[PDB]
Amino acid sequence: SYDRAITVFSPDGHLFQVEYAQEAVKKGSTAVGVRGKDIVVLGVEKKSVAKLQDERTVRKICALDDNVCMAFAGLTADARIVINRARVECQSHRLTVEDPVTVEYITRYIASLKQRYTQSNGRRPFGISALIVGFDFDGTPRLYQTDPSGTYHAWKANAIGRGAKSVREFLEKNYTDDAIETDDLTIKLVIKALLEVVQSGGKNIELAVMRRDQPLKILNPEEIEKYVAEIEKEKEEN
Amino acid sequence: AKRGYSFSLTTFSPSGKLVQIEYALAAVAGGAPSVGIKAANGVVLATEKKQKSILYDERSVHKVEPITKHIGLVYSGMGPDYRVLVHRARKLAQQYYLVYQEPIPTAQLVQRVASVMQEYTQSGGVRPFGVSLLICGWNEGRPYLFQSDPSGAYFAWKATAMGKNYVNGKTFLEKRYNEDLELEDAIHTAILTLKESFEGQMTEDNIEVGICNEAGFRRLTPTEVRDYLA
Amino acid sequence: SRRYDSRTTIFSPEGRLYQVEYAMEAIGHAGTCLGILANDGVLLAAERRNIHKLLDEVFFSEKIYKLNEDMACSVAGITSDANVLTNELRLIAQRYLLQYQEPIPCEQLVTALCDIKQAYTQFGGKRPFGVSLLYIGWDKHYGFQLYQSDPSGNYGGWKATCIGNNSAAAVSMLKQDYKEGEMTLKSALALAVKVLNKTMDVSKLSAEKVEIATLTRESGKTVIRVLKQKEVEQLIKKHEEEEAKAER
Amino acid sequence: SRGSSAGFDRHITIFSPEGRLYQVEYAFKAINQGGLTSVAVRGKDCAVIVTQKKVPDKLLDSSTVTHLFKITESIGCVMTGMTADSRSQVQRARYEAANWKYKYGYEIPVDMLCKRIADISQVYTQNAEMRPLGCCMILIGIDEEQGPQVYKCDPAGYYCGFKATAAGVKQTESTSFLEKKVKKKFDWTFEQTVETAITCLSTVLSIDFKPSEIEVGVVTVENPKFRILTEAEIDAHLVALAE
Amino acid sequence: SSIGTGYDLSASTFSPDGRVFQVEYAMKAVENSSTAIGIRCKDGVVFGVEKLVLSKLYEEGSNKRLFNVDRHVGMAVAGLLADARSLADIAREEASNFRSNFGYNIPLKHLADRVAMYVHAYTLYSAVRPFGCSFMLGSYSANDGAQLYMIDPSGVSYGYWGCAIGKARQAAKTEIEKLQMKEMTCRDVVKEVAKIIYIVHDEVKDKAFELELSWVGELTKGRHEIVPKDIREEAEKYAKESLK
Amino acid sequence: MEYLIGIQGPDYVLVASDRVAASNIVQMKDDHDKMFKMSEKILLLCVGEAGDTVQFAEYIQKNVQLYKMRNGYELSPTAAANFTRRNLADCLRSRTPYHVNLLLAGYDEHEGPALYYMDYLAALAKAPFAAHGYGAFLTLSILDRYYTPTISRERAVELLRKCLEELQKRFILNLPTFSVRVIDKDGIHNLENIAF
Amino acid sequence: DRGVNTFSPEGRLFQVEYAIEAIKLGSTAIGIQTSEGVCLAVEKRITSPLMEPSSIEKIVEIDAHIGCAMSGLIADAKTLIDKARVETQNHWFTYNETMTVESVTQAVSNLALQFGEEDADPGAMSRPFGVALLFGGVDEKGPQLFHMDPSGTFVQCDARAIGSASEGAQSSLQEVYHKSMTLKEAIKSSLIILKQVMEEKLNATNIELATVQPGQNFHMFTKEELEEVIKDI
Amino acid sequence: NQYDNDVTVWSPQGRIHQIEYAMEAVKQGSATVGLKSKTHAVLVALKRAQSELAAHQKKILHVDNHIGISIAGLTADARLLCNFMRQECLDSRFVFDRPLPVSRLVSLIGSKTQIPTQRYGRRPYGVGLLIAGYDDMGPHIFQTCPSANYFDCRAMSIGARSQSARTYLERHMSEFMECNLDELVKHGLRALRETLPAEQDLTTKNVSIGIVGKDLEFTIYDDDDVSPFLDGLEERPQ
Numbered sequence A: 001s002y003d004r005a006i007t008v009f010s011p012d013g014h015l016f017q018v019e020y021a022q023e024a025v026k027k028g029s030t031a032v033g034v035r036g037k038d039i040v041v042l043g044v045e046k047k048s049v050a051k052l053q054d055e056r057t058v059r060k061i062c063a064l065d066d067n068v069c070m071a072f073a074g075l076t077a078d079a080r081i082v083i084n085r086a087r088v089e090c091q092s093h094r095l096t097v098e099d100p101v102t103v104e105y106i107t108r109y110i111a112s113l114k115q116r117y118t119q120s121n122g123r124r125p126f127g128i129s130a131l132i133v134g135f136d137f138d139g140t141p142r143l144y145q146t147d148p149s150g151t152y153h154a155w156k157a158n159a160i161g162r163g164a165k166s167v168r169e170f171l172e173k174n175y176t177d178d179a180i181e182t183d184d185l186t187i188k189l190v191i192k193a194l195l196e197v198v199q200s201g202g203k204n205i206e207l208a209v210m211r212r213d214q215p216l217k218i219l220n221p222e223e224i225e226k227y228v229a230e231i232e233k234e235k236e237e238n
Numbered sequence B: 001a002k003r004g005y006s007f008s009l010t011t012f013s014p015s016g017k018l019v020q021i022e023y024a025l026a027a028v029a030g031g032a033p034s035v036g037i038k039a040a041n042g043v044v045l046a047t048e049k050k051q052k053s054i055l056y057d058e059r060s061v062h063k064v065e066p067i068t069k070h071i072g073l074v075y076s077g078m079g080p081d082y083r084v085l086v087h088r089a090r091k092l093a094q095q096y097y098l099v100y101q102e103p104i105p106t107a108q109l110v111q112r113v114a115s116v117m118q119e120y121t122q123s124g125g126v127r128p129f130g131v132s133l134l135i136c137g138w139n140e141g142r143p144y145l146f147q148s149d150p151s152g153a154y155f156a157w158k159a160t161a162m163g164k165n166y167v168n169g170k171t172f173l174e175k176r177y178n179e180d181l182e183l184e185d186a187i188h189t190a191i192l193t194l195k196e197s198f199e200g201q202m203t204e205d206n207i208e209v210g211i212c213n214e215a216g217f218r219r220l221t222p223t224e225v226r227d228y229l230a
Numbered sequence C: 001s002r003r004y005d006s007r008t009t010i011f012s013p014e015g016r017l018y019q020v021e022y023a024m025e026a027i028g029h030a031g032t033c034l035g036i037l038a039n040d041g042v043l044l045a046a047e048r049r050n051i052h053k054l055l056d057e058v059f060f061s062e063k064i065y066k067l068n069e070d071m072a073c074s075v076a077g078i079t080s081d082a083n084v085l086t087n088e089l090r091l092i093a094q095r096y097l098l099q100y101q102e103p104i105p106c107e108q109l110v111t112a113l114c115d116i117k118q119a120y121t122q123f124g125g126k127r128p129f130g131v132s133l134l135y136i137g138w139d140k141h142y143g144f145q146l147y148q149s150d151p152s153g154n155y156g157g158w159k160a161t162c163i164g165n166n167s168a169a170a171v172s173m174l175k176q177d178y179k180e181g182e183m184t185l186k187s188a189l190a191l192a193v194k195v196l197n198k199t200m201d202v203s204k205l206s207a208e209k210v211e212i213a214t215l216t217r218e219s220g221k222t223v224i225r226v227l228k229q230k231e232v233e234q235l236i237k238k239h240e241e242e243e244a245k246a247e248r
Numbered sequence D: 001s002r003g004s005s006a007g008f009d010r011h012i013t014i015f016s017p018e019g020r021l022y023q024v025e026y027a028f029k030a031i032n033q034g035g036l037t038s039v040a041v042r043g044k045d046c047a048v049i050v051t052q053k054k055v056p057d058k059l060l061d062s063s064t065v066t067h068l069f070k071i072t073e074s075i076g077c078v079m080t081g082m083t084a085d086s087r088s089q090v091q092r093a094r095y096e097a098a099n100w101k102y103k104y105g106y107e108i109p110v111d112m113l114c115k116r117i118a119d120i121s122q123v124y125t126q127n128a129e130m131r132p133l134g135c136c137m138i139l140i141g142i143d144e145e146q147g148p149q150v151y152k153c154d155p156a157g158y159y160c161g162f163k164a165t166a167a168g169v170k171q172t173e174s175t176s177f178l179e180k181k182v183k184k185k186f187d188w189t190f191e192q193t194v195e196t197a198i199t200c201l202s203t204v205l206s207i208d209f210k211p212s213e214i215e216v217g218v219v220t221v222e223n224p225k226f227r228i229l230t231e232a233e234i235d236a237h238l239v240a241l242a243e
Numbered sequence E: 001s002s003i004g005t006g007y008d009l010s011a012s013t014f015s016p017d018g019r020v021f022q023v024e025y026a027m028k029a030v031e032n033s034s035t036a037i038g039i040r041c042k043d044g045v046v047f048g049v050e051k052l053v054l055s056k057l058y059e060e061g062s063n064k065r066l067f068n069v070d071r072h073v074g075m076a077v078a079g080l081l082a083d084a085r086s087l088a089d090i091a092r093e094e095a096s097n098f099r100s101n102f103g104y105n106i107p108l109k110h111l112a113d114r115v116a117m118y119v120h121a122y123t124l125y126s127a128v129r130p131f132g133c134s135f136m137l138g139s140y141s142a143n144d145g146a147q148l149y150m151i152d153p154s155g156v157s158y159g160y161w162g163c164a165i166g167k168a169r170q171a172a173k174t175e176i177e178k179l180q181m182k183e184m185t186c187r188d189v190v191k192e193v194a195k196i197i198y199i200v201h202d203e204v205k206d207k208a209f210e211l212e213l214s215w216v217g218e219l220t221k222g223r224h225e226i227v228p229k230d231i232r233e234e235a236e237k238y239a240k241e242s243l244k
Numbered sequence F: 001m002e003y004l005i006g007i008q009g010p011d012y013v014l015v016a017s018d019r020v021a022a023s024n025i026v027q028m029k030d031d032h033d034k035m036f037k038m039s040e041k042i043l044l045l046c047v048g049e050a051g052d053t054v055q056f057a058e059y060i061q062k063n064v065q066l067y068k069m070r071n072g073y074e075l076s077p078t079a080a081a082n083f084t085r086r087n088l089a090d091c092l093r094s095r096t097p098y099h100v101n102l103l104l105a106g107y108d109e110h111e112g113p114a115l116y117y118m119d120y121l122a123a124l125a126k127a128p129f130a131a132h133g134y135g136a137f138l139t140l141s142i143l144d145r146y147y148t149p150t151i152s153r154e155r156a157v158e159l160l161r162k163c164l165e166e167l168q169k170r171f172i173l174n175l176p177t178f179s180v181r182v183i184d185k186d187g188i189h190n191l192e193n194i195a196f
Numbered sequence G: 001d002r003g004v005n006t007f008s009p010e011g012r013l014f015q016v017e018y019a020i021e022a023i024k025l026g027s028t029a030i031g032i033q034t035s036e037g038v039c040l041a042v043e044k045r046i047t048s049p050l051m052e053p054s055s056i057e058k059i060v061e062i063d064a065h066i067g068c069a070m071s072g073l074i075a076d077a078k079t080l081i082d083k084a085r086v087e088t089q090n091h092w093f094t095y096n097e098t099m100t101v102e103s104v105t106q107a108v109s110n111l112a113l114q115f116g117e118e119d120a121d122p123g124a125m126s127r128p129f130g131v132a133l134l135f136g137g138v139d140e141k142g143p144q145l146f147h148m149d150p151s152g153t154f155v156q157c158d159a160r161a162i163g164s165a166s167e168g169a170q171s172s173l174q175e176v177y178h179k180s181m182t183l184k185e186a187i188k189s190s191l192i193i194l195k196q197v198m199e200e201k202l203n204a205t206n207i208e209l210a211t212v213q214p215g216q217n218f219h220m221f222t223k224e225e226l227e228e229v230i231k232d233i
Numbered sequence H: 001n002q003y004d005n006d007v008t009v010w011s012p013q014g015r016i017h018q019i020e021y022a023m024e025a026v027k028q029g030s031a032t033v034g035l036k037s038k039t040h041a042v043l044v045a046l047k048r049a050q051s052e053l054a055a056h057q058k059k060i061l062h063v064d065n066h067i068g069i070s071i072a073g074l075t076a077d078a079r080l081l082c083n084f085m086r087q088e089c090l091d092s093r094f095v096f097d098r099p100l101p102v103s104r105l106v107s108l109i110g111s112k113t114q115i116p117t118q119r120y121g122r123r124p125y126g127v128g129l130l131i132a133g134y135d136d137m138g139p140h141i142f143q144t145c146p147s148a149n150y151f152d153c154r155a156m157s158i159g160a161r162s163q164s165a166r167t168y169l170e171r172h173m174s175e176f177m178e179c180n181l182d183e184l185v186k187h188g189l190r191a192l193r194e195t196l197p198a199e200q201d202l203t204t205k206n207v208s209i210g211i212v213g214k215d216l217e218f219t220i221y222d223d224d225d226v227s228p229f230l231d232g233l234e235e236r237p238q
């Protein structure tokens, strides 16, 4: 077996291999998640599909369990492993314990997996950050996010990838009860925050919504463009 | 007590070229010349066996080796590395026969032997083989000639040459070789291609040659080589 | 010991993997390989890099591999690494069949090999497979499909794509000509010859220099055929005759 | 562009731009680091071994200083190079010889023992974790079917059968000596083959040595048992040369 | 004499002139250590070692460089003492394995042969370093007679009538050449061993020293043991008074 | 000793299982469910060893669910049944084998209604109708008698009625309540439990 | 390039010394051992008002009578915390008792230099933990506070501070400590020193506070309770 | 330097630098003194504090009823060797029912400490110990180092400024053999005193003493239990 320490401490006290993996996520596609009152909504961008490519395969929103879904940024090859490892853990938690997985537990597992890859011999850390979205069994909405180091935090709204620094700052200015009042305005809050950084056009936006008790819904390029119509109606006017 | 290296000694350069394989290709390109010709009713394989001294026993070691009843081998490059590939190919031929009770198709042997060559371009603590193999065979009433190289890649040939002056040997064969030869005619043009890169006078001890047909594979006796050298 | 370690599975300051991107350069020097999806089928068209007067031609194909009853792939890069991956693809396809007793869905087979290739970029300290693959097939879920595989272990589904020599020039050529939803196999075969002719090096184009295989659904059975030399000859000459009717 | 280097090709057993193995090539120079020369000659009825026996001081037990080794009742060998490397190869040879008889029930042929060690020496040439053995083994013995045999194996992994062979520091000059003696077809008797081996080492080094200064091991058709000649029997062959 | 940078870091790497420097640097460690001596007499073998007193706080008998490998076998070491003790343990286990397999006391030549193989094994790989010491092995029986062997870091073993290892191995060997050990009784030999140690010892570079002495012959019934305080002090007085 | 039964129609699959959880001589439960939801249209009914049944059934259940998450679509009734067969057959010549007798019922969008029978030895067979338990010996003849491949759902429940009444009259064990569910185009529907 | 188990000419392990430097980037944490209890305080370091307040957990519960404050790389810490929680319950199962604060700290200190490359397991540690820990609790030896760093060295402390501003908070504790301090003054002091060494102002949602006293168990302070201790600024 | 990164690399002079670098770790630790009479073996060590608020570090550790140690160097390497010593003493009492002779235990340290100095990737133990024990041969004072080499000694001192203590013991080494236990400890304390600077002397907080002999089992005195030894002191002279 390959027994070489890949991730080591630097003279200044830095983990370079972890920091380079954080450079990989900053090169990744823009992904934003925002918790509402009744629903939670993810939104991913920087799609730039050649229109000669079937976009059904390259979807960055994945469902881990019936009540848990996630979006990622960075090395898309690395993501597939973490996603499938989380999906296996979803059913393992269902086998060892009767109860379905809580949003915090899945986030904790993904974080512990990423942490293990920073302190284990022979392997480099994952080049991805994740945005975990789901509902508790009691019904309280939850949003979490991870990073290559193995740390996780709960968020009201957060963005990862390229232009994350720009989108995050937008959410700080635009996160009030006036934008979360309805289920529609929360979805509009995603699109507006998304279309703020991307090469403009609704054709490049894929976003998913899930209600308190309803199954995960991946929206039609028709439904999202109807909301893009409502943002440009109130752009030259407002 | 020891424990091997677990890291590849063959890696991609910025140019996108696996340098150690091309460096292994230089080892065969500098080795003694070898030639193989597929000739309608059989296959011939010939090599330069010049030991460069009269002290050597020309009968002791062989370069043209049998793998099974119907398959033979010749090489250009390093002798020690070639030996390993012979022993591995002989085992692979028997592994096939034990399972299927049928003489191994030449194409299937080369695929299995080339896969062993592939391992040493990716496995840890090892260098690739510095040998290019020439595999002949007879199965389904058809002659076969194959080339395996350090890369792990394999090619099917009507006629080819390798080692010293492999570029001049191939161009010679492009003009000299014609399809639908007789086996005995193929030995002549095999020795002729070998004469193009020899340097010295040819005796039956200076060269080694094996033939493959419907009766199987065998190495030509020193008496048989002398008769073709006229 | 660590003095000789090349550190293959390590991160670059910019946040990328060197050995992966260096392997990408190996694909660029390999043969041009394209795949086009149509309404009544899907095909692979590849440049033969093994060309000589003295080559024997024993096998049905050089770069096109049959993996499954309903699937086939083409290759660009190091052929020995390609042989290892294609053999593994045939194994995974059979393991699925043994377990579920029905053919493996197209996307799942690509996913399985990509996980192996990704593993070589993360752990083991070994060089990645310098191969890009194009998969064509039919399953009962999404019908006719086309996939592209990277040495990074990353994949994507395409309607038309290319990998190998002059790959960026070939894809932009396809982007203009490809008619989404209107493409028939006869139109896609004509487009394949058109793209190859402009892309390839020797200029005139020959039946020995190109390799084309078609995947069609006939009588409830998936039929895969590597086109004969007499068929290819007609495909090249039909484009040759339209090259003569382009001036007045 | 002869003798070019790139990477760690001078340190580990990997290829150079030319396709050479320098570590293997340095192992041949390690044979000369012993400071001794070994010569083997084959006759019609016998196979003879000869090597210089250098004893620096009388404090050393002269009986323990040897490069002549017994591997089998029929098969012997002479070692040239690093003394510790040489003894390791002898112990492995004895292991392989006895292991052959346990598996196959008959005495190991001289050529098959030589090939087996050559195959193991090849492993050090392909794997980078270990260095090759800086030593040289020349095997003698009589095959029941093919007569007398003289075989030599390399740190490179090369093995071959010979009519006559030298090894060590004065190898290149003694091979040219043997070539001249081969061209002239003598009657290769026991005395002829022993003296050809003795006179070869006595000319290239130019000593005219005492019986204590050399070692001789022989294998004959009538007596296939590998035997070291000792002082008294070598003294008989040395006074036979001065006649 | 030495090659820098590349060809001397690993034992799995040959130098351009066909040398393994890691072994040679391990051979330098024993050359720096104080002198160990041992010679073969008519009826046994005697060992002698100068033991440099680093501090007067250490006990008289500490850092023993004379070992009991087997009841009939004795070991005299010179070099890195840490490696010397591990090799003493390896030699002890080998002599124990022989009796467990064959049922009698191990022949000294074979014991020397077996341990030398273990020493040699550490000179081939990058994963391990060669042993930084050299050691001697001595035994006596009625059948095999008196025997004396010495093993160095490379894995080489030879028989000896007289042998020395350490700082002044050359100054010792020239003094041994003077003795008619083939005819001398081991009781007389101890006296001569003690004086050569005293002559070899550098009193103006090294501070002070203790003398270690060992038996293995007919007087000890074939058992390897320590030379008693009575006989040692007689040999020490002999060493000091014949130093003039 | 438990009881399972399945009846396949032209466009539906009717399945029933007893609701008794028995220990030695006592009925611990009156309302125990022996049906397992694998997909939206797949049901697995398991019978056999006390601890082995639930552990095995849930393991397959969670793996069919894992397939749904990893691919976005569910396994076909055939692929599901062949998966359960593979897992049981591989444990047959091991140190710990599972003594479970199961019945898989499903609806495919292409092939249609499906019903699979499986041994504890792991032999798979597709049947128009099947039954597990000792009650099968008393009911398979009634099924043979009145079954037609074109049976309506109204008649299927009435045929099940005839089989369950036989278990009350002739069968020595007390099985008063049964779970009844139908699988079709729309999925799994919980039907009125048959009590006596 | 060197290995992970390489000594400096000074006589120290490089990877350990560099792990100490990783702490100097982490947020400041303060523990105070009072004769009537132990208090732990830490800054959360909020990067964005979008981030949930109670999401960051730099003070955690290990047992009913033991609390732990962490600083440095948080990801590495929670691996050590889980091992500490496992140890307490393994000991409870075997001996039917609560572990001492010293034994818990010692158990974590056993994982210290258990890292390496060769001659190790496939899942063995490649590097040390970039974490400094403050174990504060009450056992049968009264209230206790312990400090631990990547070197494995653990020692009892009357009052200790670790983080980015370690020296600044250490000197402030040095002149404002009596071994007869009350628990009221203990929390006060930790709050007073915390605002001085921080870049951000002290808010009720900005910091975590915990108390372990002989009477009641380990207690996580609620926002309303923090406002009663911040009223006395 | 390039001959100083691995234990498996010999210096051209005939040395291993990594063993010598590990020896530097012992000298950086606080001083400890060990001495013996004909009946008793006494260990006296200097406790050290990083700050005045932090308590003093443990220097003396238990091994068995008849054997005790004092540490100098790395803490984790000290605890690792301490646990090995304890295990070997436990195995001896489990099998033979008699206490393990001190001479043999130190030989097991010498065998174990040697292993990592010869293997690649491994490192020497960064701790030096002073072992005080009592068996059939009476009292023993032993010294171990990062180099597997060990010493049987009448008295010894290791750590920072241990030379001053070493010289004191060397003058009074003939005194110890007929010494009373109370007089023996004072000799150990007076040696340890020499290590400290002129401004400061031995206090009840920074002195740890361990005693084993014919009379009693190994016992560690720390705070209030130490003051009887310090009281009755000949004043610090120069």
Ligand SMILES: [Cl-]
Binding pocket: A002, A003, A004, B004, B005, B006, B007, C001
């Ligand atoms: Cl490695």
Ligand SMILES: [Cl-]
Binding pocket: C068, C069, C070, C097, C103, C104
């Ligand atoms: Cl198939």
Ligand SMILES: [Cl-]
Binding pocket: D028, D136, D154, D167, D168
């Ligand atoms: Cl040679």
Ligand SMILES: [Cl-]
Binding pocket: G020, G023, G132, G148, G149, G162
């Ligand atoms: Cl700290």
Ligand SMILES: [Cl-]
Binding pocket: H028, H029, H030, H071, H072, H073, H074
């Ligand atoms: Cl210390």
Ligand SMILES: [K+]
Binding pocket: A094, A098, A099, A100
């Ligand atoms: K559940």
Ligand SMILES: [K+]
Binding pocket: E141, E142, E217, E218, E221, E222
């Ligand atoms: K005797």
Ligand SMILES: [K+]
Binding pocket: G012, G013, G016, G017, G151, H074
């Ligand atoms: K340290």
Ligand SMILES: [K+]
Binding pocket: H003, H011, H012
């Ligand atoms: K130096």
